[PDB]
C-alpha cells in the first residue's frame, strides 16, 4: 500500500487511552525541533490538512537542557494556560538557539513580557497549580508513549510518525509526506 506500518509510521505496542488526537513533543533546546518548527513548519503543514474536529496538541519535554529545560517546560505550560503559544514559540526558539540569550528562567519571562503578557499575569500562572498539573500532564504523556527522542508526533494515541521512513530530499516533499501521513493516520 501507499502508507505502511514500519515505513511512514509505526504502531505503539501499547496504545494510549484518552490521548490527544494529534500529539507533538518537542524541546526548545532541540536543534531538529528548531528545524521542524521554524524552517520546515511541520506543525503548520499538519494543521492545514487535518480533518474537521481534530485538534493539534504540542508538549514540551524536560530531558534536554537541565534546569533551563525544565524551566522551558514550565513556561510552555504557562503559554498553554494563557493561550499565547503562537506568540512565544518563535522568540523562545530564537532566544534559546539563534541568539542564545535565554540562559535563565528570568530570560524566558522576558520573552513573554516583550510579547505583551503582563508580568503579574505571567508570574501568577508560573506559580499556579494549574501550571503544575500542566507540567505533570506533559511529563505523563511522554511516559505514556514511552518517548525516547524529539521531535516526535503521535496520532490517536496509537500511531507514531516515522520520518526516517520518508523521503529527505526536497524538504517540501518530506514535509508534504509527513503532513499527508498525519492526515491518513487521523482517519485510520
Q: Which residues contact 173 (CB under 8 A, 6 or more apart)?
A: 167
- State which H helix or E strand residue 5 sits in: none
At residue 144, the 3 state secondary structure works out as helix
Residue 138 CA, distance from chain mean position:
10
Query: SS in 3 state form for 40-99?
Result: CCHHHHHHCCCCCCCCEEEEECCCCCHHHHHHHHHHHHHHHHHCCHHHHHHHHHHHHHHC
What's the Rg (C-alpha) of the chain? 17
Find, among 65, 124, 118, the residue nearest to 92 by Cα. Answer: 65
Q: Which residues contact 178 (CB under 8 A, 6 or more apart)?
A: 42, 45, 46, 161, 163, 166
Q: Using CA atoms, how far apart are residues 68 and 42, in angstroms rounded to an integer? A: 25
Write down how long the chain is: 188
Domain range annotation of the chain:
1-188
Resolution in A: 2.0
Find, among 63, 62, 88, 74, the residue nearest to 127 by Cα. Answer: 74
- Architecture of 1-188 per CATH? 3-Layer(aba) Sandwich (3.40)
Amino acid at each position: 500500500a501507499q502508507y505502511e506500518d514500519g515505513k511512514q509510521y509505526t504502531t505503539l505496542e501499547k496504545p494510549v487511552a484518552g490521548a490527544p488526537q494529534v500529539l507533538e513533543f518537542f524541546s526548545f533546546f532541540c536543534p531538529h525541533c528548531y528545524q521542524f518548527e521554524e524552517v520546515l513548519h511541520i506543525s503548520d503543514n499538519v494543521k492545514k490538512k487535518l480533518p474537521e474536529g481534530v485538534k493539534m496538541t504540542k508538549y514540551h519535554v524536560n530531558f534536554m537542557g537541565g534546569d533551563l529545560g525544565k524551566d522551558l517546560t514550565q513556561a510552555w505550560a504557562v503559554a498553554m494556560a494563557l493561550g499565547v503559544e503562537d506568540k512565544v514559540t518563535v522568540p523562545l526558539f530564537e532566544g534559546v538557539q539563534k541568539t542564545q540569550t535565554i540562559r535563565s528562567a528570568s530570560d524566558i519571562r522576558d520573552v513573554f513580557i516583550n510579547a505583551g503578557i503582563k508580568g503579574e499575569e505571567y508570574d501568577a500562572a508560573w506559580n499556579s497549580f494549574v501550571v503544575k498539573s500542566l507540567v505533570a500532564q506533559q511529563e505523563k504523556a511522554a511516559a505514556d508513549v514511552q518517548l525516547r527522542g524529539v521531535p516526535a508526533m503521535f496520532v490517536n494515541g496509537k500511531y507514531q510518525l516515522n520520518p526516517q521512513g520518508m523521503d529527505t530530499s526536497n524538504m517540501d516533499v518530506f514535509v508534504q509526506q509527513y503532513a499527508d501521513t498525519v492526515k491518513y493516520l487521523s482517519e485510520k
